[PDB]
């Protein structure tokens, strides 16, 4: 009795609940078992699109959250509007007490992206 063919199914059961407007894919293989998560997501919906987040969480023990923002250095400072989006997302994440793997991070990211339009 073993899965032996996928990641920890905890994050599977979590991501199965999220809205269909979030499209998660598979990045280069660096989050197979221990890290277990490469949250490469697209907000394919009626709202305006943006840069896919990284959001690399930790083992299912969750002594951490997802947001890591590696590819952000050039993805955010180039566009002023996207820079404001990043500022809003950071201010929201800092105000999130112990955010969680997929639900909290993606929800905060989407709400900041579609609130900071102005």
């Amino acid at each position: 009795e073993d899965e032996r063919q996928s990641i920890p199914n905890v994050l599977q059961g979590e991501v199965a609940r999220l809205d269909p407007k979030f499209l998660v894919n598979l990045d280069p293989s660096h989050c197979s078992n221990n890290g277990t998560v490469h949250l490469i997501c697209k907000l394919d919906d009626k709202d305006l699109p943006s840069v896919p987040p990284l959001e690399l969480s930790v083992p299912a023990d969750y002594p951490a959250q997802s947001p890591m923002w590696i590819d952000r250095q050039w993805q955010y400072d180039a566009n002023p509007f996207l820079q404001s989006v990043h500022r809003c997302m950071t201010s929201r994440l800092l105000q999130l007490p112990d955010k969680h793997s997929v639900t909290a991070l993606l929800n905060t990211w989407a709400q900041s992206i579609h609130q900071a339009c102005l």
Binding site: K46, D47, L48, P49, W74, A78, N79, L82, C117
Partner: protein, 233 residues
């Protein structure tokens, strides 16, 4: 063709530059087929801009291509035969906005289309050398140095090297033409009008003429040590 009228309306009714993509995806299934992408947007807007950069539109194109396709942009800016136009103004903003491609990255195609991206950069290189023709003003230049410096910005190693190598393995006619164009461009820029002129340009010329020769040229030297292998053999 209705996309053209939609963009013309978005200009007639100027937008918040973030609802831009909202209204754009509103007129299409937004995922069914993107073979009708911006491959006509920038060309149309700038050719009708003529002797003007047409502001408030390129910003929307940038906020789109922040997360959009890149092969089409490259093949357009390569096929944009601005040499006959040569307004020396539109190409300025064009290079200014295209520098981001070499700045951040040349994204993936997720399929064999990525290999086609190589082709694009190939033509881009050719198209880049076309700005050397713009160096033939002889008003006594101003934008030639800019085009050469952004060209150099494009030639950051370990990024385009293998891409242009695969491009050369695609066909040899285009690469031989690129070599002849580099020869002509060096012969033209031999008249060093400035200190950095014909110096960094020569560096880029040497780079592009040396890269397709070998990408793994191990220059390990002065590595003298115990060499008994051939001895014992």
């Amino acid at each position: 063709v209705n996309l053209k009228q939609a963009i013309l309306q978005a200009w007639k009714e100027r937008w918040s530059d973030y609802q831009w993509a909202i209204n754009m995806k509103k007129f299409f299934p937004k995922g069914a087929t993107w073979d009708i992408l911006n491959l006509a947007e920038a060309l149309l807007e700038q050719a009708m801009i003529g002797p003007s950069p047409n502001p408030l539109i390129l910003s929307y194109l940038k906020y789109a291509i922040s997360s959009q396709m890149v092969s089409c942009s490259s093949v357009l800016t390569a096929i944009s035969k601005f040499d006959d136009f040569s307004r020396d103004l539109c190409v300025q903003a064009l290079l200014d906005i295209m520098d981001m491609f070499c700045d951040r990255l040349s994204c993936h195609g997720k399929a064999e289309e990525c290999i086609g991206l190589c082709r694009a950069l190939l033509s881009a290189l050719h198209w880049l050398l076309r700005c050397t023709a713009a160096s033939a003003e002889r008003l006594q230049e101003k934008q030639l140095a800019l085009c050469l410096q952004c060209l150099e910005k494009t030639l950051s190693s370990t990024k385009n090297r293998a891409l242009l190598h695969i491009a050369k393995l695609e066909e040899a006619s285009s690469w031989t033409a690129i070599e002849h164009s580099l020869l002509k461009l060096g012969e033209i820029l031999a008249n060093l009008s400035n200190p950095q002129l014909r110096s960094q340009a020569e560096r880029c010329g040497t780079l592009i003429r040396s890269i397709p020769s070998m990408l793994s040229v191990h220059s390990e030297q002065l590595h003298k040590t115990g060499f008994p292998t051939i001895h014992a053999l």
